[PDB]
Every structure is written in structure tokens, then in C-alpha cells.
């Protein structure tokens, strides 16, 4: 039910260069024209980018990078924010995130995915614990992640992951990376999301 309203915001993303599909992932709308996106992809180069079929050029959107406090230290989240100069409205789902969430073990976990490989998919998983920092093979550091047990191929990055606490269904952040039957999300705080909605509305 809520799960679907998250999907309404999730959109297939891709990165092209010289005509060939170089990369592919997801992005989740949070408000207005703001989309949560895997930062470690805008690092490596792109020519064109497709969001939901829209043939975007480089100069038509702008990216916001955030820092996170991991053990009282300041690192740059792998969850970035792609904002279109002009585009379509997504729902405000920023109201669903939180800030001081410590999720219990074994709890269910859902991963709303929408891309060009699989399509509009959801998956299930189990909550493990908080991981401080995770480093990729090329050095794409991913701080403040959250570990959950589930099957996650490539192109799931950017999808929206939601769990439970009490009677509430909280969105934690966006799926970042994984493999080995385990997955990782860039933990995103509501406070952070609101302080940017102020600056864009």
C-alpha cells in the first residue's frame, strides 16, 4: 500500500556515453523534482543520462552531495541528490524518513526497485546491524551504511529500502551496493532531507 506510493517515486536510471548504455540503476523521488541517486556513478563519466525515458543532457539537472556523522566524524554519503532544472513532480515522501533510527535485528526489509533490467520490482530481506564504512574495489567509499540480508544484483542501487519500528514504516535511505546475499543502504536522515527541501521547495 505505502510500498506502492514509494514505487510511484522510483524511476529507471541509466548513464550513456557515445550511444552505448554504460551504466544502469534506480532513483527515488522524495519531493518536487529531487531524486535520491547513487553518487558513485556520477563520479565515473557520463555523456547523456536517461530518467524514466526522458533523454536528459548533462546541463539539465544538478547534484547535491551530503556529509554524514559516522562516530562523530564527517564523511560524504554515497546517496546524492539529482535535482532537475525543469521536470515532473514526485510525491513528498520525505515525511516518512526519520533521524535517530536504530533498527532491531531480524526484522523484515523491503527494497523497491525500478530499472531497465528487471523493471518495477520489490524484494524482501532481514535487518542485520549498522555498518560504519564500506570501501569499493576502486575506492568508492560508502559511509554510514546499513547491512541487511537479501539477494541484490547490480542495478538495484538507488532503490528505496523500508523497514518497521513500532507501528511505523520508515524509509531508511537508498540501496547502495552489495553482493554475497547481503545488501547495503546509505542511511539517510529526515532532518537532512528537510534542510534541502527548504533550499528548493
Author numbering: 7 to 207
Show passages lifted from the paper.
Cell entry in infected hosts is followed immediately by translation of a large open reading frame in the viral RNA. This yields a polyprotein precursor of over 2,000 amino acids that is processed into fourteen distinct capsid and non-structural proteins for virus replication. The majority of this processing is done by the virus-encoded 3C protease (3Cpro), which cleaves the precursor at ten distinct sites. FMDV 3Cpro may also assist infection by proteolysis of host cell proteins and has RNA-binding activity that is important for initiation of replication of the viral RNA. Crystallographic analysis of the 3Cpro from a type A FMDV (sub-type A1061) showed that, similar to other picornavirus 3C proteases, it adopts a trypsin-like fold consisting of two β-barrels that pack together to create a centrally-located Cys-His-Asp/Glu catalytic triad in the active site.
